[PDB]
Design a protein around this ligand. Structure first.
Ligand SMILES: NC(=O)C1=CN([C@@H]2O[C@H](COP(=O)(O)OP(=O)(O)OC[C@H]3O[C@@H](n4cnc5c(N)ncnc54)[C@H](OP(=O)(O)O)[C@@H]3O)[C@@H](O)[C@H]2O)C=CC1
Ligand SMILES: CCc1nc(N)nc(N)c1-c1ccc(Cl)c(/N=N/N(CCOC(C)=O)Cc2ccccc2)c1
Length: 205
């Protein structure tokens, strides 16, 4: 198992809502563009050898548009307890998150040209719950949607809340930029009648 820290990436409403009907309930081209920069960005000196990983629960797998997967420029892994068959061409599936990480280490060791850079968990709610409890999860890339859209699926831990304020802290914008490496818009962004904003929350292991 593990060596490296985990990063969770989520887009949620102020009520912690994350989806409805096996879909993320909004249409945001610039917010989806953000997901893509974060999840495929590796430093220049390292982009040479290094590739990122996206860990996801299979309903999130399903939920993705046939057109966009396997997500490109990334190692895709699907967490499924009933790993029967996985339709893909180099797409891994694992029994759980620790299984996914031994799998990757094993598979991207010394007999490889492709090294792992950063590891991201992309959801859904059941995979977000297990990560939140992993001793290696130390950062949450969150996109806050300033609107109470109807959702039926919720993020499992109210991390921006008063109850978690001694563990999870919001980081300065300048450090969110420095971590993702692309400059990023500060404050509210308006796209299709929705208000949103990017944040970076961190905890000490
Ligand atoms: N807004 C955002 O940023 C995001 C929104 N979403 C939304 O969330 C929804 C998907 O959520 P959710 O239903 O909770 O499902 P998940 O995507 O977490 O997938 C559920 C499946 O994943 C597998 N799995 C997940 N965690 C584990 C574990 N700890 N151990 C073993 N297997 C595990 C199991 O598969 P099996 O049954 O095969 O055993 C479980 O059925 C959709 O609406 C999606 O759009 C999803 C991600 C990000
Ligand atoms: C709101 C997107 C998002 N933003 C952030 N900041 N975090 C998240 N976990 C997710 C996120 C959440 C749930 C799903 Cl199913 C998702 N699928 N990710 N898609 C594919 C995106 O394609 C690529 C290259 O990344 C579905 C999707 C497909 C096509 C268009 C829009 C969305 C992406």
């Amino acid at each position: 198992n593990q060596q490296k820290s985990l990063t969770l990436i989520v887009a949620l409403t102020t009520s912690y809502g994350i989806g409805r009907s096996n879909s993320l309930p909004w249409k945001l081209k610039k917010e989806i563009s953000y997901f893509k920069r974060v999840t495929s960005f590796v430093p220049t000196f390292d982009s040479f050898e290094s590739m990122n990983v996206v860990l996801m629960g299979r309903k999130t797998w399903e939920s993705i548009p046939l057109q966009f997967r396997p997500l490109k420029g990334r190692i895709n892994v699907v967490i499924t307890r009933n790993e029967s068959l996985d339709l893909g061409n180099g797409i891994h599936s694992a029994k759980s998150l620790d299984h996914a990480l031994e799998l990757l280490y094993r598979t991207y060791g010394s007999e490889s040209s492709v090294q792992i850079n950063r590891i991201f968990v992309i959801g859904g709610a059941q995979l977000y719950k297990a990560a939140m409890d992993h001793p290696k999860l130390d950062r949450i890339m969150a996109t806050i949607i300033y609107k109470d859209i109807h959702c039926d699926v919720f993020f499992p831990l109210k991390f921006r809340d008063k109850e978690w304020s001694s563990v999870w802290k919001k980081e300065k914008h300048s450090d969110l930029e420095s971590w993702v490496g692309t400059k990023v818009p500060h404050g509210k962004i308006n796209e299709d009648g929705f208000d949103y904003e990017f944040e970076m929350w961190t905890r000490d292991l």
